[PDB]
Amino acid sequence: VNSFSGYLKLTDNVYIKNADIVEEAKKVKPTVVVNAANVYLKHGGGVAGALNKATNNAMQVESDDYIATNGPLKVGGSCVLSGHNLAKHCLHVVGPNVNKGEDIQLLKSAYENFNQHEVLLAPLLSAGIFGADPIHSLRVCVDTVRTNVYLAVFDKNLYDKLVSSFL
Ligand SMILES: CCC(CC)(CO)Nc1ncnc2[nH]ccc12
């Protein structure tokens, strides 16, 4: 039993809700919140910009030190950093950005990072400003993640379409 509330159960391990991931994290304080990161950990917009804003830019400060030490992530890769006031940890995961021409096949690799954590609060990878089809992202999530994932979909209209079209 966990404290995630109001989710629709899609499969044995995948759950979904129309919610703002920032407000969900602040309520649940999960062990792991997933950020829709880029390889430079520049949290300017989308989910990343919203999470970073909620940390009063502490996420960005920590991220800049991470990059200065380690260099950029790989597309499809991840790193674990602090969750600041939102969660114990933040798993920064880089899905491909279609608006940069990046290979969509890397979306499966991106979701594989979730399997290193027993329970996660997450967005749909490569959705929103990353330019991929959120329906496809949900399919890859369900077919790749084996640990317990709670998906927050900000747009109410998109959520209803994801639910209604889910096979
Ligand atoms: C902008 C698209 C979407 C769904 C509304 C997923 O790709 N992005 C988010 N999904 C969950 N929580 C969010 N908070 C701020 C943005 C955001």
Curated annotation (Swiss-Prot):
Q: Which domain of life is it from?
A: Viruses
This protein's membrane topology, according to the annotation, is: Multi-pass membrane protein
Q: What region holds the Macro domain?
A: 1-167
The record's subcellular location field reads: Host endoplasmic reticulum membrane
Coiled-coil annotation reads none
**According to the UniProt entry, how is activity regulated?**
Inhibited in vitro by GRL-0617.
Q: How does it assemble?
A: May form homohexamers. Interacts with N protein.
Q: What is this protein called?
A: Papain-like protease nsp3
Name of the coding gene: rep
Entire-sequence positions represented here: 1025 to 1191 of 7096
